[PDB]
Amino acid sequence: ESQYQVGPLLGSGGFGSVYSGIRVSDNLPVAIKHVEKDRISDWGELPNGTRVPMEVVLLKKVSSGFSGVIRLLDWFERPDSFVLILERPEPVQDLFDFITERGALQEELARSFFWQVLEAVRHCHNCGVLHRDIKDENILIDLNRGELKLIDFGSGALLKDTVYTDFDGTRVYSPPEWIRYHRYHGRSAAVWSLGILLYDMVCGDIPFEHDEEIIRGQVFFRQRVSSECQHLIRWCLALRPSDRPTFEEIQNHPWMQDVLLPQETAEIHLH
Numbered sequence: 001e002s003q004y005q006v007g008p009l010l011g012s013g014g015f016g017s018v019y020s021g022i023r024v025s026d027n028l029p030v031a032i033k034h035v036e037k038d039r040i041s042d043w044g045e046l047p048n049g050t051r052v053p054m055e056v057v058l059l060k061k062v063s064s065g066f067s068g069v070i071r072l073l074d075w076f077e078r079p080d081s082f083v084l085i086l087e088r089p090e091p092v093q094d095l096f097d098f099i100t101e102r103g104a105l106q107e108e109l110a111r112s113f114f115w116q117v118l119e120a121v122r123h124c125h126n127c128g129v130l131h132r133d134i135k136d137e138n139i140l141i142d143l144n145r146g147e148l149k150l151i152d153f154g155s156g157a158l159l160k161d162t163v164y165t166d167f168d169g170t171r172v173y174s175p176p177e178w179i180r181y182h183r184y185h186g187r188s189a190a191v192w193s194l195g196i197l198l199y200d201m202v203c204g205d206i207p208f209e210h211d212e213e214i215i216r217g218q219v220f221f222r223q224r225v226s227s228e229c230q231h232l233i234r235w236c237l238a239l240r241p242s243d244r245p246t247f248e249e250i251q252n253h254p255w256m257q258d259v260l261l262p263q264e265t266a267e268i269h270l271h
């Protein structure tokens, strides 16, 4: 390609291979993601006939000024793969690596980060998109600005109000009704994953590893965590889907009051 200068490989795995690059016209930092045609779970269609990974359909749906979801800048089709050109914050670290380095997060830091993830998930749902793989590996932190960005819509779907009976996101974030029945609805399955994520932020590891632990849904804390935060987590991890909070109820909960804005968070917590 002559539109982008390719830099180091940043990582590879079920998401494909992702390289650092720069757009040659204006030096903008980008990430260049290659996904093999044989490993794409779902396909969508652009308004015009072109069959594309679902991920491309979903990223176009979520596009706007709103900075909480990674932007798709361009995409290319090759004979055996698709190449996605995405925004790349610089300096950046994903939340998985951040928690690996710092351990359990201070609650004021977790509250700012969790709030920004809820604003990004609400924006996806308002655009008709369900991510289906919310987890710390799929959240990037713009370290200078304190802003978080959701990435990787490769397991996502268009949002619907009937039941889902397929799933290929991350099993330890997936809800008890998926494990037991292979059936879930989108918003309540999303809120269960948010409960897992909030526990991972304030404890430094996820609460469940085994199917039997997910089904029993009993949460224990190894780290000191305030009673209001443990209430929110246990509410989001209610075993009955209809007992979990809506997004409005999460952002109105007492633990979510008084959030730092992203720049304030970067000044206080980010080196």
Ligand SMILES: Cc1cn([C@@H](C)[C@]2(F)CCNC2)c2nc(C(N)=O)cc(Cl)c12
Residues within 6 Å of the ligand: 010, 011, 012, 015, 018, 031, 033, 070, 086, 087, 088, 092, 094, 137, 138, 139, 140, 151, 152, 153
């Ligand atoms: C900047 C960046 C880095 N990565 C990956 C190499 C990870 F760091 C690996 C686990 N978290 C993202 C990315 N992955 C994706 C993706 N999976 O869609 C998108 C971006 Cl922007 C990035």
